[PDB]
């Protein structure tokens, strides 16, 4: 119903600097800082109160929806050391210490990459702080020795001055780091004095330098939460992109266009010639957010250039980090290859290079269980990434994608890896499922009835007097092609018109093939168009377009012409007439653009038709590859012409062309045994 | 040009109580009244000044555009007696007296009915007042004895108490009357104390009774003229009707609709259940103004009832005066018979009785020179009244009437008879000629070019492959029928559409007759409609109506049906489509009215078609009279349905039906030898 939509809208108008689950680990360090003015106790007890409030039934601390030793142990350690250092509420320390001691051994049995960032860097400092309290603690553990060895390895791996000159990710986790400067390192924080926007690093920093820039930041965050802090703040750009991405993939973006373009122009104003980070001011930038923003901004008529990607290339390779070549995960390259589809022909080839590198890197590991990310856990990655690597941009239909994603969006059941298991709900909410699924279900139920309506219409016209193989399957497929490009209820007019004239042209093409052609013509077929229920105004235009199509049928005879582009042009003209829209006065650029679009469509149709023709003759595949490249070029070109926010022509008028061409390419790029499958899944196979 | 139109409009918004030429005769009597407060001189010298200003080159007084002894003599008499009674400016009396004396004899040679009202009644009192001055005056004249004898005759003809009880016209001219009461006669003046709204009677009355009601009236009129008074005042209703009558007959009423309906509702508010007079308050009412107002009010959607005419009927006769049966003139009965056309069937038969009585009274005297009125002189009455008695309401076309009237409207060259030769210019102006003629001329020049346009179109279509006798004359007549019902430039769309589909239907009817009928059908004629240049929206509706007409052609075969009403219904539908108008939601009354109109049209067409059919077979004329009555009844009925100001349907939508039916009746009620005549006169024969 609507209430979900309205709540989501109002919550979406209220985009703050961030919405993430409040962490406890960092709060514990916040408690460790005393009162500034030589006070008697800690700086802020609100954190303390928050801590006492949320003692687990097993005394632990952390998200209950999951169970992770490496994180529970650190949360418990930080809490117990904080409260007992300040020597208060010792009973809770006792309550948790039993679980601590009895769980001390489970750590040796963890997963491969489920290893928190600097996890082996804080834990040493953790037990160090502990040995001042020095309770009963089995410090004796080979796991401790292993992480110690890795500590020494990475310590021998890191420089001193490059570390003191070049701002790197290590500044995110510097508290477990020692043996440092405070002036050469002083300037390597963010615009707000935060080091990598992480509160723990800055808190430990202020512990050794009273720069008010850190105090004001922390005070603001603790004064905006009143007990509790996250592990990273803020995440404006991150959530901004990641919400609109869902709302596009969830097929509900039809309603929130205003707020959508609001966050869009925000990102645009904050766009850099160098890349993007989770926040506006973080100097170090990564590739994944950059690519995602690139894709989304292009997809809405914003002029950007992709040579910014020339920073994440590594001399014939690509690595998500700028300066670090570590084995990347699936998601960054996934979004990269995705954004690598909408290439405009006037752009540098870095996009193509990244595309081929990415597809190579992905297709191999696809067959195995390599879909495990190092920094997030979702419901089902493999299916999504597989379909993506399967159905290119030119063969993508919106409804089938949203249907597939309806079982691949996890909602709340996800977690995000950081220094602690955190989760965001602003865009990982679950009411999104209710809204989208209700919408899709009613949409299905509407398509179901209009289907039978069209069925009885088609039977009334006795069109099978010159039918095909069987009218049922083909009429189903035809109406499906229309329904898949337009799902809004208020356009069933254009929907049914499309389907009807499609069936018509099919019938007459069949009849013409069966008799040989227009030399064997006998009947007045320019009246056959009347079989469509006509309005008062929509009559004459259609008959004119129909006679035009017939004249084309005449002229295309005796030659080696194809007969497809004619049909596509007829289709777009008719869809427009049914949409009841005109063009304006027609300054020369306007009709120039129009004719350009039409010529592109006709050419593409002829080309891929001939390709299919050769495909059926067992032709040598190299020819198929040649023709595929050929259609690809003008495909890209047409897309660029449709996606220009500077166009003088209307928008819907543009996307119509896309609808038709995508329909044709799709139906020309799959066996029916998949088409019917998709058909039943989207129509008859019901949700909820 | 426009300036004439704007001046006429602004002058028309300024309708005063009256606009008539200022008389001098009555002013002379006004001068005769002394100062009220025992003053030293006359009451108002402004009249005197006015008099001295306008001494004629022959010393006389009166309109110079005409020369009438009976009036010049009285004006001169009144002036000389006034000025010399007050013994001032005697030289002017001498200057005029020579012409007076030398003209004293011409009076014996006047016209039959060119005899002013009470002319023989004031002249005796005139010479009576003179014999006090008693200058050289040949009182000896047999003409004086004749008018004296008639004085005595009428004095023996008039009663005393009926004259003292019943307000009659004699109260208009009572100054030459003596031997009277002043109380029984006191109440027989108008609402304003004026006796018959004439200033002379009231002035002589105040001379013998100082009723302020007369003083204020006269003061107002002399204070609103500052020297000079008319012979009758005011004339609000008179001019109100007589201006809009012209503006309707002059074919320019298209522009002044606001002010038109303003004066209309004025007359309506002042409408009585008893009749009308020249002014609002005159108790005695006459028939001519009543009938004229009746006609004009009905012609604009105002509900009135005609039993008010039962007052002017004289036991099987009609006489313009209520109570006096004197030999009437042409004009009153003329307007009466005119108003007697738009009879609604639900009305009493007094209209029909008056119609037959009037036509009988008129047709006889038509052949002679009986078109002389007793109270006005115009340019050419006979032609106008003849055409009126020739072309009934059902056979009246607006353009031919306005063209004929363009040579029958005299403009300023007219005079109006009263106690003195007076003239009004508010509605007898001459700039009306400039405006109307310029309009008509440009209209002609537009029709001339669109004619050649349609000619070349008709030739382009090769329609003569199944032509008629000769395309030229018939296509001319067809386009003429359209142009004669619509002359506004902005409707050439509907004009040309009408003409084109008329030619079409003619062609196909011819082809069908020539082959025998739809059994011998061979070609797809429901495509023949495409030969008309179609717009984007106006296409489908026309093809639908065309196929409807064809289906009618099919069904009407093998029967004794006619094939005309179908054509008329097709015509109105097509004219409407070209006009680009719809009906509203269609509450039941709406479509009820619609269907009613359509059924009426079809029936009338069939009936008069069959009548013409019998007419060509030398059928017995009584059958023709029977069928004529038959069409007449439903003709009246249809007219009543069109002329209801209470209709829920639009106006133009209504008058369209009238246009078509009037076209059909007209073309069915005249030899072509008159049609072509009218055609050349209206199109090629140019004005100015």
Q: Quick count: other Cβ atoms within 10 Å of Cβ A235?
A: 21
DSSP letter (8 states) at residue A224: T
The rounded Cα A443 to chain-centroid distance in angstroms is 23
Rounded (5°) CA angle A8-A12-A15 = 150
Q: Is B269 helix (H, G, I), strand (E, B) or coil?
A: helix
Q: Name the maximum alpha-carbon separation found in chain B.
A: 105
Q: SS3 breakdown of chain B: % helix, strand, coil, rounded to 5? A: 60, 0, 40
How many residues are given for chain B? Answer: 688
Distance CA B452, CA B445 (A): 12
Distance CA A234, CA A249 (A): 25
- What are the C-alpha distances in Å from B673 to residues A342, A440, B171, B679? 79, 77, 55, 10
Rounded (5°) CA angle B599-B600-B604 = 120
Q: Which of A582, A505, A513, A596 is nearest to A541 (CA)?
A: A582
Instruction: Judge if the upstream peptide bond of residue B234 is cis by omega within 30 degrees of 0.
Output: yes
For the CA atoms of A382, A388, A389, A395, the dihedral, rounded to the nearest 10 degrees, stands at 150
Parallel, antiparallel or unpaired: strands B415-416 and B313-314: unpaired
Residues 543-562 of chain A whose Cβ lies under 8 A from any Cβ of chain B: 543-544
> Does B285 belong to an annotated binding site?
no
Tokens 């704007």 belong to B6
Strand partners, A145: none
Closest chain A residue by Cα to residue B540? A539
Inter-chain CB proximity A539 and B535 less than 8 Å = no
Tokens of A144: 């401790």
Residue B571, judged by CB atoms within 10 A of its CB (0-12, 13-18, 19+), counts as: buried
- What are the C-alpha distances in Å from A324 to residues A311, A319, B397? 12, 7, 97
- What are the C-alpha distances in Å from A620 to residues A605, A614, A628? 21, 9, 13
Distance from CA of B397 to the nearest CA of A (A): 34
Strand partners, A589: none
Distance CA B167, CA B178 (A): 17
- What are the C-alpha distances in Å from B440 to residues B242, B559, B687? 22, 47, 8
Inter-chain CB proximity A537 and B534 less than 8 Å = no
φ, ψ of residue A209 to 5 degrees: the values are: -155, 120
Distance from CA of B503 to the nearest CA of A (A): 22
| DSSP state string for A324-391 | ------HHHHHHHHHHTSS--TTS-THHHHHHHHHHHHHHHHHTTT----SSEE-S-HHHHHHHHHHS
Q: Quick count: other Cβ atoms within 10 Å of Cβ B400?
A: 17
Q: Which of A287, A285, A288 is nearest to A197 (CA)?
A: A285
Distance from CA of B524 to the nearest CA of A (A): 9
Closest chain B residue by Cα to residue A530? B540
Q: Which of A56, A61, A52, A49 is nearest to A24 (CA)?
A: A61
How many residues are given for chain A? Answer: 688
Contact B479, B454 (CB under 8 A): yes
Inter-chain CB proximity A538 and B534 less than 8 Å = no
Partner residue opposite B541 with nearest CB, options A524, A536, A541: A536
Distance CA A306, CA B517 (A): 76
Contact A556, A566 (CB under 8 A): yes
φ, ψ of residue A376 to 5 degrees: the values are: -165, 160
Tokens of A338: 């995705």
Rounded (5°) CA angle B336-B337-B338 = 90
> Does B265 belong to an annotated binding site?
no
Residues 437-456 of chain A whose Cβ lies under 8 A from any Cβ of chain B: none
Tokens of B2: 């426009």
Contact A590, A583 (CB under 8 A): yes
> Does B286 belong to an annotated binding site?
yes
Q: Is A299 helix (H, G, I), strand (E, B) or coil?
A: coil
Q: SS3 breakdown of chain A: % helix, strand, coil, rounded to 5? A: 60, 0, 40
Tokens of A308: 């910014």
Q: Does any CB of chain B come closer than 8 Å to the CB of residue A646?
A: no
SS3 string, B50-93, reads HHHHCCCCCCCCCCCCCCCHHHHHHHHHHHHHHHHHCCCCHHHH
Q: Which of B508, B501, B494, B433 is nearest to B466 (CA)?
A: B508
Distance from CA of B543 to the nearest CA of A (A): 9
Tokens of B500: 């084109």
Residue B545: its chain A contacts at CB < 8 A? none
Q: Is B21 helix (H, G, I), strand (E, B) or coil?
A: coil
Residues sharing a CB contact under 8 Å with residue A33, sequence separation 6 or more, in sequence order: A42, A43, A203, A206, A207
Please report the sign of the dihedral spanned by the C-alpha atoms of residue A113, residue A117, residue A118, residue A124. negative
For the CA atoms of A248, A249, A252, A254, the dihedral, rounded to the nearest 10 degrees, stands at 30
Please report the sign of the dihedral spanned by the C-alpha atoms of residue B378, residue B383, residue B385, residue B387. negative
Q: Which of A228, A171, A198, A192 is nearest to A54 (CA)?
A: A228
- What are the C-alpha distances in Å from B617 to residues B620, B623, B670, B672? 9, 12, 17, 18
Tokens 């209950």 belong to A64
- What are the C-alpha distances in Å from A188 to residues A117, A163, A192, A207? 20, 10, 11, 17
- What are the C-alpha distances in Å from B24 to residues B20, B84, B88, B93? 12, 15, 17, 15
Residue B575, judged by CB atoms within 10 A of its CB (0-12, 13-18, 19+), counts as: buried
Residue A452, judged by CB atoms within 10 A of its CB (0-12, 13-18, 19+), counts as: exposed
- What are the C-alpha distances in Å from A654 to residues A180, A566, B409, B517? 59, 18, 65, 52
Q: Which of A185, A358, A196 is nearest to A285 (CA)?
A: A196
Instruction: Judge if the upstream peptide bond of residue A234 is cis by omega within 30 degrees of 0.
Output: yes
DSSP letter (8 states) at residue A286: B
Contact A45, A51 (CB under 8 A): no
Q: Is A314 helix (H, G, I), strand (E, B) or coil?
A: strand
Distance from CA of B234 to the nearest CA of A (A): 58
DSSP letter (8 states) at residue A317: E
Please report the sign of the dihedral spanned by the C-alpha atoms of residue A359, residue A361, residue A366, residue A371. negative
Q: Which of B637, B678, B682 is nearest to B661 (CA)?
A: B637
- What are the C-alpha distances in Å from A198 to residues A188, A202, A407, A424? 13, 7, 34, 16
A565-579 and A492-515 are packed helices; what angle lies between their axes, rounded to 10 degrees? 150
Q: What burial letters (b/e) apply to A45-56, b meaning 16+ CB within 10 Å? A: ebbbebbeeebe
Q: Does any CB of chain A come closer than 8 Å to the CB of residue B535?
A: yes
- Resolution reached, in Å? 3.5
Distance CA B394, CA B657 (A): 12
Parallel, antiparallel or unpaired: strands B313-314 and A317-318: unpaired
Distance CA A634, CA A627 (A): 11
Distance CA B534, CA B549 (A): 19
Distance CA A286, CA B433 (A): 89
Distance CA B643, CA B339 (A): 14
Distance CA A315, CA B647 (A): 87
Which helix (H) or strand (E) element contains residue B318?
Answer: strand B317-318
Alpha-carbon Rg for chain A in angstroms:
31
Residue B580: its chain A contacts at CB < 8 A? none
Inter-chain CB proximity B537 and A535 less than 8 Å = no
Inter-chain CB proximity A541 and B543 less than 8 Å = no
Strand partners, A376: A416
Distance CA B429, CA B432 (A): 6
Strand partners, B229: B23
Please report the sign of the dihedral spanned by the C-alpha atoms of residue A452, residue A453, residue A458, residue A462. positive
Q: Does any CB of chain B come closer than 8 Å to the CB of residue A539?
A: yes
Q: Quick count: other Cβ atoms within 10 Å of Cβ B208?
A: 9
Tokens of A507: 């019938």
φ, ψ of residue A39 to 5 degrees: the values are: -70, 175
Q: Which of B312, B422, B330 is nearest to B380 (CA)?
A: B330
Query: Please, where are the H alpha helices in B86-136?
Result: 90-103, 119-133
Distance CA B423, CA B21 (A): 5
Distance from CA of B518 to the nearest CA of A (A): 20
| DSSP state string for A560-592 | S--SSHHHHHHHHHHHHHHHT----S--HHHHH
**Hey, of A536, A550, A573, A578, which one would you mutate to test binding to chain B, going by the most B CBs within 10 A of its CB?**
A536
The rounded Cα A414 to chain-centroid distance in angstroms is 15
- What are the C-alpha distances in Å from A540 to residues A461, A543, A578, B536? 20, 5, 12, 6
Strand partners, B276: B286
φ/ψ bin of A329: left (φ > 0), alpha (ψ from -120 to 50), beta (otherwise): beta
This structure was determined by cryo-EM
Contact A82, A32 (CB under 8 A): yes
Q: Which of A362, A231, A226, A243 is nearest to A293 (CA)?
A: A243
Q: Does any CB of chain B come closer than 8 Å to the CB of residue A531?
A: no
Residue A544: its chain B contacts at CB < 8 A? 539
φ/ψ bin of A89: left (φ > 0), alpha (ψ from -120 to 50), beta (otherwise): left
Distance CA A92, CA A84 (A): 9
Distance CA A440, CA A686 (A): 9
Inter-chain CB proximity B536 and A534 less than 8 Å = no
Distance CA B267, CA B237 (A): 7
Partner residue opposite B534 with nearest CB, options A524, A534, A540: A540
| DSSP state string for A644-671 | -TT-SS-SHHHHHHHHHHHHHHHHTSS-
Distance CA B171, CA B198 (A): 9
Contact B306, B351 (CB under 8 A): yes
Q: What burial letters (b/e) apply to A529-538, b meaning 16+ CB within 10 Å? A: bbbbebeebb
**Hey, of B522, B531, B535, B536, which one would you mutate to test binding to chain A, going by the most A CBs within 10 A of its CB?**
B536
For the CA atoms of A456, A458, A464, A470, the dihedral, rounded to the nearest 10 degrees, stands at -80
Q: Quick count: other Cβ atoms within 10 Å of Cβ A79?
A: 26
φ, ψ of residue B357 to 5 degrees: the values are: -60, -45
Residue A538: its chain B contacts at CB < 8 A? 540
Rounded (5°) CA angle B220-B226-B230 = 70
Q: Does any CB of chain A come closer than 8 Å to the CB of residue B539?
A: yes
Q: What burial letters (b/e) apply to A630-667, b meaning 16+ CB within 10 Å? A: bbeebbbbbbbbbbeeebebeeebbebbbbbbbbbbbb
Contact B18, B233 (CB under 8 A): yes
Contact A543, B536 (CB under 8 A): no
Residues 342-381 of chain B whose Cβ lies under 8 A from any Cβ of chain A: none
Question: Residues of A at the annotated binding site for substrate?
Answer: 154, 374
Query: Please, where are the H alpha helices in A111-232?
Result: 119-133, 142-157, 161-165, 199-206, 212-223
Q: Is A470 helix (H, G, I), strand (E, B) or coil?
A: coil
Which helix (H) or strand (E) element contains residue B137?
Answer: none
Contact B445, B683 (CB under 8 A): no
Distance CA A341, CA A636 (A): 9
Tokens 């007209």 belong to B666
Residue B5, judged by CB atoms within 10 A of its CB (0-12, 13-18, 19+), counts as: middle
Q: Quick count: other Cβ atoms within 10 Å of Cβ B541?
A: 20
Partner residue opposite B539 with nearest CB, options A524, A527, A540: A540
Contact A507, A535 (CB under 8 A): no
Q: Quick count: other Cβ atoms within 10 Å of Cβ A673?
A: 7
Tokens of A463: 């069109």
Distance CA A185, CA A170 (A): 12
Distance from CA of B472 to the nearest CA of A (A): 31
Q: Quick count: other Cβ atoms within 10 Å of Cβ A6?
A: 11
């Amino acid at each position: 119903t609507t209430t979900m939509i309205d709540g989501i809208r109002t919550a979406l108008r209220s985009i703050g600097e961030g919405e993430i689950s409040i962490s406890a680990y960092d709060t514990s360090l916040v408690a460790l800082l005393k009162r500034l003015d030589g006070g008697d106790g800690p700086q802020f007890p609100s954190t303390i109160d928050w801590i006492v409030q949320n003692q687990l039934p097993d005394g632990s601390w952390g998200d209950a929806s999951f169970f992770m030793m490496g994180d529970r142990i650190m949360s418990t350690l930080a809490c117990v050391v904080a409260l007992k250092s300040w020597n208060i509420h010792t009973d809770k320390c006792e309550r948790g210490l039993l679980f601590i001691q009895e769980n001390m051994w489970r750590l040796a049995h963890e997963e491969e990459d489920w290893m928190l960032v600097g996890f082996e860097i804080a834990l040493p400092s953790l037990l160090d702080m502990a040995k001042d309290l020095d309770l009963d603690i089995p410090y004796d553990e080979p796991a401790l020795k292993a992480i110690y060895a890795e500590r020494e390895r990475k310590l021998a791996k890191i420089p001193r001055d490059v570390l003191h000159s070049m701002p790197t990710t290590l500044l995110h986790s510097l508290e477990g780091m020692v043996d440092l400067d405070w002036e050469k390192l002083l300037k390597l924080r963010c615009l707000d004095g935060s080091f990598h926007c992480s509160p723990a690093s800055t808190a430990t920093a202020f512990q050794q330098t009273g720069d008010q820039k850190c105090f004001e930041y922390l005070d603001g965050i603790v004064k905006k939460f009143n007990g509790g802090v996250p592990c990273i703040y803020p995440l404006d750009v991150y959530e901004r992109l990641w919400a609109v991405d869902r709302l596009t993939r969830l097929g509900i973006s039809r309603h929130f266009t205003s707020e959508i373009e609001d966050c869009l122009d925000y990102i645009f104003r904050n766009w850099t010639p160098d890349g993007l980070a989770h926040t506006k001011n973080c100097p170090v930038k990564d590739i994944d957010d950059t690519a995602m923003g690139f894709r989304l901004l292009r997809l809405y008529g914003y002029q950007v250039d992709p040579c910014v990607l020339k920073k994440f290339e590594k001399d014939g390779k690509f690595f998500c980090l700028h300066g670090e070549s570590n084995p990347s995960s699936v998601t960054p390259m996934y979004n990269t290859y995705r954004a690598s589809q909408l290439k405009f022909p006037g752009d540098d080839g870095v996009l193509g290079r990244a595309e081929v590198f990415c597809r190579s890197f992905l297709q191999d590991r696809r067959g195995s269980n390599r879909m495990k990310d190092k920094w997030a856990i979702a419901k089902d990655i493999p299916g999504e990434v597989e379909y993506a690597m399967d159905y290119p941009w030119k063969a993508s239909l919106p409804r089938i994608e949203t249907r597939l994603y309806l079982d691949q969006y996890g909602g709340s059941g996800d977690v995000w890896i950081g220094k602690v298991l955190h989760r965001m709900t602003l865009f990982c909410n679950d009411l999104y499922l209710k809204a989208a699924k209700a919408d899709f279900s009613n949409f299905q139920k509407e398509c179901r009835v209009e289907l039978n309506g069209l069925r009885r219409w088609y039977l009334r016209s006795n069109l099978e007097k010159f039918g095909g193989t069987d009218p049922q399957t083909t009429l189903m497929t035809s109406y499906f092609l229309a329904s898949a490009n337009i799902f809004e209820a208020n356009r069933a007019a254009e929907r049914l018109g499309w389907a009807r004239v499609a069936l018509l042209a099919d019938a007459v093409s069949s009849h013409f093939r069966r008799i040989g052609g227009p030399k064997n013509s006998t009947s007045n077929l320019e009246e056959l168009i009347s079989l469509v229920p006509f309005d008062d105004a929509y009559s004459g235009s259609l008959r004119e377009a129909w006679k035009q199509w017939l004249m084309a049928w005449t002229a295309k005879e005796s030659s080696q012409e194809s007969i497809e582009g004619d049909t596509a042009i007829l289709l777009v003209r008719a869809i427009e007439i049914f949409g009841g829209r005109h063009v304006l006065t027609g300054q020369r650029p306007d009709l120039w653009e129009y004719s350009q679009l039409e010529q592109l469509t006709s050419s593409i149709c002829c080309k891929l038709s001939r390709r299919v023709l050769a495909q059926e003759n067992g032709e040598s595949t190299e020819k198929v590859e040649e023709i595929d490249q050929q259609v690809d070029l003008e495909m890209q070109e047409l897309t660029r012409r449709v996606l220009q926010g500077c166009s003088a022509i209307n928008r819907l008028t543009r996307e119509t062309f896309l609808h038709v061409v995508k329909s044709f390419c799709y139906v020309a790029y799959c066996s029916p045994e998949t088409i019917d499958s998709h058909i039943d899944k989207v129509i008859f196979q019901d949700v909820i």
